[PDB]
Amino acid sequence: MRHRKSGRHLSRTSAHRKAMFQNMAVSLFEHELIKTTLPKAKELRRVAEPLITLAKEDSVANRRLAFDRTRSKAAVGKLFNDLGKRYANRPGGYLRILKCGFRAGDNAPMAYVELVDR
Amino acid sequence: KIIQQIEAEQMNKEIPAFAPGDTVIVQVKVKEGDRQRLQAFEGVVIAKRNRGLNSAFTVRKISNGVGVERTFQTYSPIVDSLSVKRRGDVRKAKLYYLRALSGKAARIKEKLV
Amino acid sequence: MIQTQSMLDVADNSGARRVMCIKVLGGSHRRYAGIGDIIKVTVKEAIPRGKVKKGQVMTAVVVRTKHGVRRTDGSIIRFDGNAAVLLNNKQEPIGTRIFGPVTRELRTEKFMKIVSLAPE
Amino acid sequence: IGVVGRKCGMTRIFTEEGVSIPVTVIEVEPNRVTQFKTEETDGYRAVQVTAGERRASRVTKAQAGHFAKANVAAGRGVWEFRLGEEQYAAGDQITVDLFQAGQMVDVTGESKGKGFAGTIKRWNFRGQDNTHGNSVSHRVPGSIGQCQTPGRVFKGKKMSGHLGAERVTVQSLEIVRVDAERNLLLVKGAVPGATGGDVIVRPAAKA
Amino acid sequence: AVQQNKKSRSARDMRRSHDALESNALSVEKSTGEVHLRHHVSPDGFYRGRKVV
RNA sequence: GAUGUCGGCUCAUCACAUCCUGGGGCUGAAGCCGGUCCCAAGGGUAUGGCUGUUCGCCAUUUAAAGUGGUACGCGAGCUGGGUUUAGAACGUCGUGAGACAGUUCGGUCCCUAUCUGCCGUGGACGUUUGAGAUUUGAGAGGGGCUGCUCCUAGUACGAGAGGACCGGAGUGGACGAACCUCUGGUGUUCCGGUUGUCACGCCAGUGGCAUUGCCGGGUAGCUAUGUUCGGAAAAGAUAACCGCUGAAAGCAUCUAAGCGGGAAACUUGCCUCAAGAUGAGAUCUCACUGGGAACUUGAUUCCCCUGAAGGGCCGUCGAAGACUACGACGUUGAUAGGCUGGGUGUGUAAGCGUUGUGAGGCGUUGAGCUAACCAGUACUAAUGGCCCGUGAGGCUUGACC
RNA sequence: CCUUGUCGGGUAAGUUCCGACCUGCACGAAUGGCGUAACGAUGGCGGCGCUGUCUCCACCCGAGACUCAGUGAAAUUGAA
RNA sequence: CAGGUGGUCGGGUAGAGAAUACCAAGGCGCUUGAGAGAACUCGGGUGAAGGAACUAGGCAAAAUGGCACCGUAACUUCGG
RNA sequence: AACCCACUCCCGUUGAAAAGGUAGGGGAUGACUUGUGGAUCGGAGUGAAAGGCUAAUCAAGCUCGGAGAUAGCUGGUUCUC
RNA sequence: GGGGAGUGAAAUAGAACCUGAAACCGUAUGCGUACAAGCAGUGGGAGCCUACUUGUUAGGUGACUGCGUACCUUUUGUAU
């Protein structure tokens, strides 16, 4: 009935969601602008932004708490050194979502998701 | 911010600090036959809700060879007082595995000394 | 106990050891019977000489459930095991001796004898 | 006559003797009379009220002029109350003060929208069996009607769809507490709807 | 479960009296001067007076 | 040129020849009980052991376990146990192939709903200028059950035994509605423990896969088995029944005039829908106060200007939802996400120190993490865009101007 | 067949089951009669465990259903 | 086109194993997707209190599950 | 376990499949399973037997002829007064 | 795949090519259709719109209204 129930299923298992969302997090932390479907953009912002908030503080516990949930060495290095010193004075909202037409093969509503000071 | 103040005006103190695993003695109120008195209920605290006014705790006693769990309502005035007899090492929050252990198996360790 | 064909212990001295509820007395189709309610049992297992023999249809009061009884503040007592106390026709308990605790919800006009005998 | 408030969720009260009484708390921001409908000018006796705070940009000019006849400066919704014989001027302010404790009361809100229920959830039907040979239909309704007499389904047949946001009155609920300093009714038991839904509290029809 | 009669032109077309289209949510950038969907990035990559891509 | 059985399940719907509950009359009705016959169809009206069973017989309940019509209601809703194709066997009949007032084991149940119907939910247009809101109620639906202990009273009554109606609570059952504060269930979106293996260079730490690998718990939400509420009282017109007065028919007679009492039936009372109630109702408020031409003068058509009140598209969403609709909000902004606190859950993280030979303990440390929850906060996203909707609302008649 | 024969046991209750009885409608000795350890995806009864079979279903997870984009059947049909 | 089709080779860790689980060499993402998160339907997960009351019938499910040691009844053709 | 089989449920029945799939199940050193080649054929084969099988066909295959079999049966039979 | 230009007597003879019917599918114009119940017509009939030239006409719609259960085949008989 999903009264007050957050999260969306995206026609997937939960492990598939977890893999796809930390993939999109890693790909956005390297490219700083990716292009995806609008619901996956709406659900990326609940995965990817706590990683930048976590990255605003250098600890060993913070860098292997980042590493177990974004599991790539390059994105833990991109965080804590670039994203997290940049976003150190911004209270949330580290990424914006801009709708960009529709996909040609589907009609999947597309969106750009972009780090805010890029 | 409204129903969190209807609650807080009723939560005047009754309570010590107790954990799951502790043995407590609850002093409960009874009233039948035109009298007010206290009946003790000693046993092992196995559960705790911590919902403010809606807080509860389950406690297990083995009286006359059979088990009995009472889930007390914490800020009810039936629970007149509470006292931790001994307190135990459990490293759990809900000790429901004690419902299957029977005798010496259902003994709670004392590392918490 | 709570339902026809529930097996439940006997808290009496010279009767059964296991009874089985065959009917929940009360309404038209009461499906449940808690503490203080009146079931009718058959005796499935009993002691070699005693007042009650095996396969005898009898009435019993349910004194001890593991669904439990609930008080006027939302506190439940919840036993570990279902047990009944057998009764005669003019419903007085057959045993002169009652084992284990009962609860306070049982001292009505008719079952004061049970609460008076119990080691609650 | 009654009052309009919003449901703030359910709480509990312990009495001193030790019984916990289940309590819903209906927050009543004070209701403001907008019209007084008289049988001479309207055909029946009633009073319109308002409960607070709509934005200025969401109040239309027709609605703002209606709220500016009565110098009320008024808010979300407009409700009505049939009256027997009571006189309200069009600026008056009816509060929780028209309720005492004790004071059996009827409370109406809109029930929680269950979406499109099936016949088991909507009309408490029985399910068929789950295993004993049963083909695809374990939870479906059974037959609808009879065969060729009448050869159609009777009207009002219990079928499935929308256990929703219908208006539900829950009647004879006792008032536990009238808390006029911070504008609250505490009401014994359940009340239809979710938290923050609008809810109409007027005295009991079965007294 | 089939029809016992073929459906006429008239009832066939009355069924599809509902399936006509709309998409009128177009607007013009003040800067560039081109049409795009509301709340969407332009086909030349602009959005509210700023290039974003 | 096919209308596919019996039974069970699921769902019903009507009758009344009434099973309970309600109202009466007579009695060979002292009272508890009854017997029978009227009136009444509002609501209720078992679970099981056996057998394929319908039925039946038992067991135990209940206030009662009603009788019937509906293709012996209901298989384009389910079953497929019985009958029942092909296999086999027993007894019997037949020389035999085979057969049965017969038994016995085994044995494929197809359909995506066009139309009527029905349950929901919209889109159009119309309601006489248009709009935002609030409404009256013609009509319709739901609801309607009942047990027990007590209180006058061991009284009235009855030698006694026995046992009341009628007065009013308070506690159940079944049913129904709402709700989630409590009790619990769930909780693959939270936190742990753990096995096997693989990986992140490695140690540590951790992550994939093993049904969520297995499991311990558990937030919100949904939820029953949990909580709360309900059936009424009251009124009216009555059914049998009980009548007052009262003749026809000096009397007697409920009746022929005329007046009364009288039931869960009927109409209200209770809840919900309800002006597509084309008979389209009513309120309060808001918006529009420009020219010209042709032809035909409810005047229409065309051009120019002007497009208001408001509605919508769109966006952020919802305890609203299949899509809708509904509801809230759109920078003059807390609508969602993030963020900052709290809370809740889990249960003492990592790292470092310390003890030990090591597994592993002790500190730091109720620590770390924490979803949907609570409060705050413009950091991100809701763009001073477009489209519809117009320009004072016909005529006749009457009354007051 | 009568037939759910009668009696015993098992159950609160047993047309089924097991043990008898013998009035065998209509058993019977290689179309074999009686037993019989072991062996059956064999028939019938009972028990312990076990449980969503059930009381009575609640919630959750995926796959359809629903909406959007692309492609695009069918049986049937005198006309409506 | 979820089917069928003879023979050959066969690594690690766990393992009796060529079972199985995770992997190596090697191969692949099964040629419609995007949303949404109603009824119902399918394939699963957990389930209070009962524990076969379900049903023609425990059908389905739930359960048991290994290795070593101990122990093990009637009956028997002496092997079980 | 492979392999061979097909007892049960559920699905599927316009199928992914003119006989399958998923869970379970039976045999699994033999009266076993299987490749390749060969033999038996239509009142005729083969059959641990069921009217089973003999090219999705079986109480007498398929095809071509006799042949436009026969039908006291069914259906149909076309412009006008 | 078209829009022109050319060729040709002709390209609405353009190669899927003479003619190019009906089923079936469209666009445009006129009129009628959102309080009305059924073999869809037929008798009556207002209104409107076009051509004419006007009227006691011609074409097109057909509000409203009376009557009205297809065709075949088989039959004692069929809306069936």
PDB file of N, CA and C (backbone and C1' of nucleotides) in Angstrom, chain J residues 46-70:
ATOM      1  P     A J  46     -44.161  19.439 -42.786  1.00  0.00           P
ATOM      2  O5'   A J  46     -43.430  20.552 -41.939  1.00  0.00           O
ATOM      3  C5'   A J  46     -44.128  21.174 -40.884  1.00  0.00           C
ATOM      4  C4'   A J  46     -43.249  21.489 -39.705  1.00  0.00           C
ATOM      5  C3'   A J  46     -41.990  22.279 -39.962  1.00  0.00           C
ATOM      6  O3'   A J  46     -42.231  23.654 -40.183  1.00  0.00           O
ATOM      7  C1'   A J  46     -41.518  20.536 -38.476  1.00  0.00           C
ATOM      8  P     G J  47     -41.274  24.512 -41.141  1.00  0.00           P
ATOM      9  O5'   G J  47     -39.835  24.357 -40.504  1.00  0.00           O
ATOM     10  C5'   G J  47     -39.436  25.119 -39.379  1.00  0.00           C
ATOM     11  C4'   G J  47     -38.122  24.627 -38.845  1.00  0.00           C
ATOM     12  C3'   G J  47     -36.931  24.859 -39.736  1.00  0.00           C
ATOM     13  O3'   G J  47     -36.440  26.181 -39.682  1.00  0.00           O
ATOM     14  C1'   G J  47     -36.886  22.650 -38.985  1.00  0.00           C
ATOM     15  P     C J  48     -36.164  26.988 -41.034  1.00  0.00           P
ATOM     16  O5'   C J  48     -34.608  26.797 -41.266  1.00  0.00           O
ATOM     17  C5'   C J  48     -33.726  26.668 -40.167  1.00  0.00           C
ATOM     18  C4'   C J  48     -32.604  25.715 -40.470  1.00  0.00           C
ATOM     19  C3'   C J  48     -31.900  25.925 -41.783  1.00  0.00           C
ATOM     20  O3'   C J  48     -31.001  27.008 -41.753  1.00  0.00           O
ATOM     21  C1'   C J  48     -32.271  23.631 -41.454  1.00  0.00           C
ATOM     22  P     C J  49     -30.872  27.976 -43.015  1.00  0.00           P
ATOM     23  O5'   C J  49     -29.924  27.180 -43.993  1.00  0.00           O
ATOM     24  C5'   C J  49     -28.681  26.698 -43.525  1.00  0.00           C
ATOM     25  C4'   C J  49     -28.139  25.604 -44.399  1.00  0.00           C
ATOM     26  C3'   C J  49     -28.019  25.949 -45.855  1.00  0.00           C
ATOM     27  O3'   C J  49     -26.906  26.768 -46.102  1.00  0.00           O
ATOM     28  C1'   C J  49     -28.837  23.745 -45.607  1.00  0.00           C
ATOM     29  P     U J  50     -26.916  27.760 -47.347  1.00  0.00           P
ATOM     30  O5'   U J  50     -26.068  26.966 -48.418  1.00  0.00           O
ATOM     31  C5'   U J  50     -26.450  27.002 -49.769  1.00  0.00           C
ATOM     32  C4'   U J  50     -26.269  25.680 -50.450  1.00  0.00           C
ATOM     33  C3'   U J  50     -26.618  25.725 -51.917  1.00  0.00           C
ATOM     34  O3'   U J  50     -25.545  26.195 -52.693  1.00  0.00           O
ATOM     35  C1'   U J  50     -27.700  23.887 -50.927  1.00  0.00           C
ATOM     36  P     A J  51     -25.762  27.472 -53.620  1.00  0.00           P
ATOM     37  O5'   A J  51     -25.608  26.868 -55.078  1.00  0.00           O
ATOM     38  C5'   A J  51     -26.529  27.205 -56.088  1.00  0.00           C
ATOM     39  C4'   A J  51     -27.055  25.989 -56.793  1.00  0.00           C
ATOM     40  C3'   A J  51     -28.173  26.271 -57.777  1.00  0.00           C
ATOM     41  O3'   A J  51     -27.708  26.721 -59.040  1.00  0.00           O
ATOM     42  C1'   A J  51     -28.823  24.509 -56.361  1.00  0.00           C
ATOM     43  P     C J  52     -27.617  28.296 -59.353  1.00  0.00           P
ATOM     44  O5'   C J  52     -28.379  28.472 -60.742  1.00  0.00           O
ATOM     45  C5'   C J  52     -29.726  28.925 -60.799  1.00  0.00           C
ATOM     46  C4'   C J  52     -30.683  27.804 -60.499  1.00  0.00           C
ATOM     47  C3'   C J  52     -32.113  27.964 -60.973  1.00  0.00           C
ATOM     48  O3'   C J  52     -32.264  27.661 -62.348  1.00  0.00           O
ATOM     49  C1'   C J  52     -32.046  27.064 -58.767  1.00  0.00           C
ATOM     50  P     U J  53     -32.523  28.828 -63.426  1.00  0.00           P
ATOM     51  O5'   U J  53     -34.106  28.946 -63.497  1.00  0.00           O
ATOM     52  C5'   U J  53     -34.765  30.131 -63.073  1.00  0.00           C
ATOM     53  C4'   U J  53     -35.650  29.874 -61.882  1.00  0.00           C
ATOM     54  C3'   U J  53     -36.673  30.960 -61.581  1.00  0.00           C
ATOM     55  O3'   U J  53     -37.754  30.329 -60.912  1.00  0.00           O
ATOM     56  C1'   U J  53     -35.271  30.712 -59.732  1.00  0.00           C
ATOM     57  P     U J  54     -39.128  30.019 -61.661  1.00  0.00           P
ATOM     58  O5'   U J  54     -40.202  30.508 -60.594  1.00  0.00           O
ATOM     59  C5'   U J  54     -39.843  31.479 -59.621  1.00  0.00           C
ATOM     60  C4'   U J  54     -39.802  30.903 -58.226  1.00  0.00           C
ATOM     61  C3'   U J  54     -40.884  31.417 -57.284  1.00  0.00           C
ATOM     62  O3'   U J  54     -42.036  30.596 -57.349  1.00  0.00           O
ATOM     63  C1'   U J  54     -38.735  31.349 -56.195  1.00  0.00           C
ATOM     64  P     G J  55     -43.459  31.171 -57.803  1.00  0.00           P
ATOM     65  O5'   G J  55     -44.492  30.295 -56.962  1.00  0.00           O
ATOM     66  C5'   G J  55     -44.971  29.048 -57.456  1.00  0.00           C
ATOM     67  C4'   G J  55     -44.908  27.936 -56.429  1.00  0.00           C
ATOM     68  C3'   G J  55     -44.704  28.349 -54.977  1.00  0.00           C
ATOM     69  O3'   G J  55     -45.340  27.385 -54.146  1.00  0.00           O
ATOM     70  C1'   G J  55     -42.927  26.953 -55.647  1.00  0.00           C
ATOM     71  P     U J  56     -46.537  27.785 -53.157  1.00  0.00           P
ATOM     72  O5'   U J  56     -47.227  26.380 -52.868  1.00  0.00           O
ATOM     73  C5'   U J  56     -46.430  25.207 -52.749  1.00  0.00           C
ATOM     74  C4'   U J  56     -47.112  23.981 -53.304  1.00  0.00           C
ATOM     75  C3'   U J  56     -46.458  23.372 -54.540  1.00  0.00           C
ATOM     76  O3'   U J  56     -46.631  21.962 -54.487  1.00  0.00           O
ATOM     77  C1'   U J  56     -48.690  23.880 -55.021  1.00  0.00           C
ATOM     78  P     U J  57     -45.354  21.002 -54.475  1.00  0.00           P
ATOM     79  O5'   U J  57     -44.153  21.982 -54.785  1.00  0.00           O
ATOM     80  C5'   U J  57     -42.830  21.517 -54.643  1.00  0.00           C
ATOM     81  C4'   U J  57     -42.167  21.310 -55.978  1.00  0.00           C
ATOM     82  C3'   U J  57     -40.893  20.489 -55.927  1.00  0.00           C
ATOM     83  O3'   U J  57     -41.125  19.085 -55.739  1.00  0.00           O
ATOM     84  C1'   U J  57     -40.440  22.478 -57.055  1.00  0.00           C
ATOM     85  P     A J  58     -40.534  17.879 -56.635  1.00  0.00           P
ATOM     86  O5'   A J  58     -38.958  18.067 -56.700  1.00  0.00           O
ATOM     87  C5'   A J  58     -38.279  17.666 -57.875  1.00  0.00           C
ATOM     88  C4'   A J  58     -36.792  17.887 -57.817  1.00  0.00           C
ATOM     89  C3'   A J  58     -36.044  17.252 -56.671  1.00  0.00           C
ATOM     90  O3'   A J  58     -35.882  15.854 -56.813  1.00  0.00           O
ATOM     91  C1'   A J  58     -35.240  19.430 -57.015  1.00  0.00           C
ATOM     92  P     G J  59     -35.806  14.914 -55.512  1.00  0.00           P
ATOM     93  O5'   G J  59     -34.370  15.216 -54.916  1.00  0.00           O
ATOM     94  C5'   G J  59     -33.208  14.862 -55.638  1.00  0.00           C
ATOM     95  C4'   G J  59     -31.977  15.482 -55.037  1.00  0.00           C
ATOM     96  C3'   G J  59     -31.723  15.185 -53.581  1.00  0.00           C
ATOM     97  O3'   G J  59     -31.237  13.886 -53.343  1.00  0.00           O
ATOM     98  C1'   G J  59     -31.342  17.455 -53.961  1.00  0.00           C
ATOM     99  P     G J  60     -31.811  13.069 -52.098  1.00  0.00           P
ATOM    100  O5'   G J  60     -30.909  13.543 -50.896  1.00  0.00           O
ATOM    101  C5'   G J  60     -29.514  13.654 -51.051  1.00  0.00           C
ATOM    102  C4'   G J  60     -28.928  14.435 -49.922  1.00  0.00           C
ATOM    103  C3'   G J  60     -29.487  14.089 -48.577  1.00  0.00           C
ATOM    104  O3'   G J  60     -29.034  12.830 -48.123  1.00  0.00           O
ATOM    105  C1'   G J  60     -29.330  16.407 -48.758  1.00  0.00           C
ATOM    106  P     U J  61     -29.667  12.139 -46.835  1.00  0.00           P
ATOM    107  O5'   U J  61     -28.921  12.898 -45.669  1.00  0.00           O
ATOM    108  C5'   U J  61     -29.075  12.515 -44.339  1.00  0.00           C
ATOM    109  C4'   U J  61     -29.127  13.710 -43.450  1.00  0.00           C
ATOM    110  C3'   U J  61     -30.128  13.584 -42.342  1.00  0.00           C
ATOM    111  O3'   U J  61     -29.612  12.863 -41.254  1.00  0.00           O
ATOM    112  C1'   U J  61     -30.338  15.696 -43.354  1.00  0.00           C
ATOM    113  P     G J  62     -30.289  11.495 -40.845  1.00  0.00           P
ATOM    114  O5'   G J  62     -31.583  11.958 -40.062  1.00  0.00           O
ATOM    115  C5'   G J  62     -31.531  13.018 -39.129  1.00  0.00           C
ATOM    116  C4'   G J  62     -32.869  13.669 -38.984  1.00  0.00           C
ATOM    117  C3'   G J  62     -33.980  12.682 -38.655  1.00  0.00           C
ATOM    118  O3'   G J  62     -34.741  13.120 -37.547  1.00  0.00           O
ATOM    119  C1'   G J  62     -34.602  14.045 -40.495  1.00  0.00           C
ATOM    120  P     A J  63     -34.811  12.167 -36.270  1.00  0.00           P
ATOM    121  O5'   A J  63     -35.118  13.147 -35.079  1.00  0.00           O
ATOM    122  C5'   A J  63     -34.075  13.822 -34.418  1.00  0.00           C
ATOM    123  C4'   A J  63     -34.611  15.045 -33.749  1.00  0.00           C
ATOM    124  C3'   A J  63     -35.863  14.813 -32.931  1.00  0.00           C
ATOM    125  O3'   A J  63     -35.595  14.361 -31.614  1.00  0.00           O
ATOM    126  C1'   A J  63     -36.205  16.633 -34.384  1.00  0.00           C
ATOM    127  P     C J  64     -36.250  13.010 -31.066  1.00  0.00           P
ATOM    128  O5'   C J  64     -37.800  13.216 -31.319  1.00  0.00           O
ATOM    129  C5'   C J  64     -38.556  14.102 -30.518  1.00  0.00           C
ATOM    130  C4'   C J  64     -39.910  14.378 -31.109  1.00  0.00           C
ATOM    131  C3'   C J  64     -40.783  13.170 -31.339  1.00  0.00           C
ATOM    132  O3'   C J  64     -41.381  12.692 -30.170  1.00  0.00           O
ATOM    133  C1'   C J  64     -40.883  14.543 -33.233  1.00  0.00           C
ATOM    134  P     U J  65     -41.549  11.127 -29.945  1.00  0.00           P
ATOM    135  O5'   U J  65     -42.780  10.723 -30.842  1.00  0.00           O
ATOM    136  C5'   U J  65     -44.076  11.234 -30.596  1.00  0.00           C
ATOM    137  C4'   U J  65     -44.951  10.944 -31.776  1.00  0.00           C
ATOM    138  C3'   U J  65     -45.120   9.481 -32.120  1.00  0.00           C
ATOM    139  O3'   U J  65     -46.084   8.834 -31.320  1.00  0.00           O
ATOM    140  C1'   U J  65     -44.588  10.681 -34.071  1.00  0.00           C
ATOM    141  P     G J  66     -45.978   7.267 -31.026  1.00  0.00           P
ATOM    142  O5'   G J  66     -46.864   6.601 -32.155  1.00  0.00           O
ATOM    143  C5'   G J  66     -48.276   6.688 -32.113  1.00  0.00           C
ATOM    144  C4'   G J  66     -48.894   6.096 -33.346  1.00  0.00           C
ATOM    145  C3'   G J  66     -48.588   4.638 -33.608  1.00  0.00           C
ATOM    146  O3'   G J  66     -49.413   3.755 -32.887  1.00  0.00           O
ATOM    147  C1'   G J  66     -48.194   5.863 -35.563  1.00  0.00           C
ATOM    148  P     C J  67     -48.812   2.398 -32.303  1.00  0.00           P
ATOM    149  O5'   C J  67     -48.394   1.581 -33.581  1.00  0.00           O
ATOM    150  C5'   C J  67     -49.378   0.897 -34.327  1.00  0.00           C
ATOM    151  C4'   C J  67     -48.830   0.326 -35.601  1.00  0.00           C
ATOM    152  C3'   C J  67     -47.803  -0.777 -35.470  1.00  0.00           C
ATOM    153  O3'   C J  67     -48.331  -2.038 -35.126  1.00  0.00           O
ATOM    154  C1'   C J  67     -47.045   0.769 -37.039  1.00  0.00           C
ATOM    155  P     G J  68     -47.502  -2.985 -34.144  1.00  0.00           P
ATOM    156  O5'   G J  68     -46.154  -3.248 -34.928  1.00  0.00           O
ATOM    157  C5'   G J  68     -46.110  -4.145 -36.020  1.00  0.00           C
ATOM    158  C4'   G J  68     -44.781  -4.069 -36.717  1.00  0.00           C
ATOM    159  C3'   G J  68     -43.619  -4.633 -35.946  1.00  0.00           C
ATOM    160  O3'   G J  68     -43.580  -6.035 -35.970  1.00  0.00           O
ATOM    161  C1'   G J  68     -42.993  -2.575 -36.860  1.00  0.00           C
ATOM    162  P     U J  69     -43.281  -6.836 -34.624  1.00  0.00           P
ATOM    163  O5'   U J  69     -41.895  -7.547 -34.906  1.00  0.00           O
ATOM    164  C5'   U J  69     -40.688  -6.810 -34.970  1.00  0.00           C
ATOM    165  C4'   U J  69     -39.526  -7.706 -34.694  1.00  0.00           C
ATOM    166  C3'   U J  69     -39.508  -8.993 -35.497  1.00  0.00           C
ATOM    167  O3'   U J  69     -38.865  -8.855 -36.749  1.00  0.00           O
ATOM    168  C1'   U J  69     -39.225  -9.467 -33.195  1.00  0.00           C
ATOM    169  P     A J  70     -39.506  -9.489 -38.067  1.00  0.00           P
ATOM    170  O5'   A J  70     -38.306  -9.621 -39.088  1.00  0.00           O
ATOM    171  C5'   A J  70     -36.987  -9.909 -38.659  1.00  0.00           C
ATOM    172  C4'   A J  70     -36.005  -9.638 -39.765  1.00  0.00           C
ATOM    173  C3'   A J  70     -35.848 -10.724 -40.804  1.00  0.00           C
ATOM    174  O3'   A J  70     -36.839 -10.654 -41.801  1.00  0.00           O
ATOM    175  C1'   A J  70     -33.725 -10.027 -40.092  1.00  0.00           C
TER     176        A J  70
END
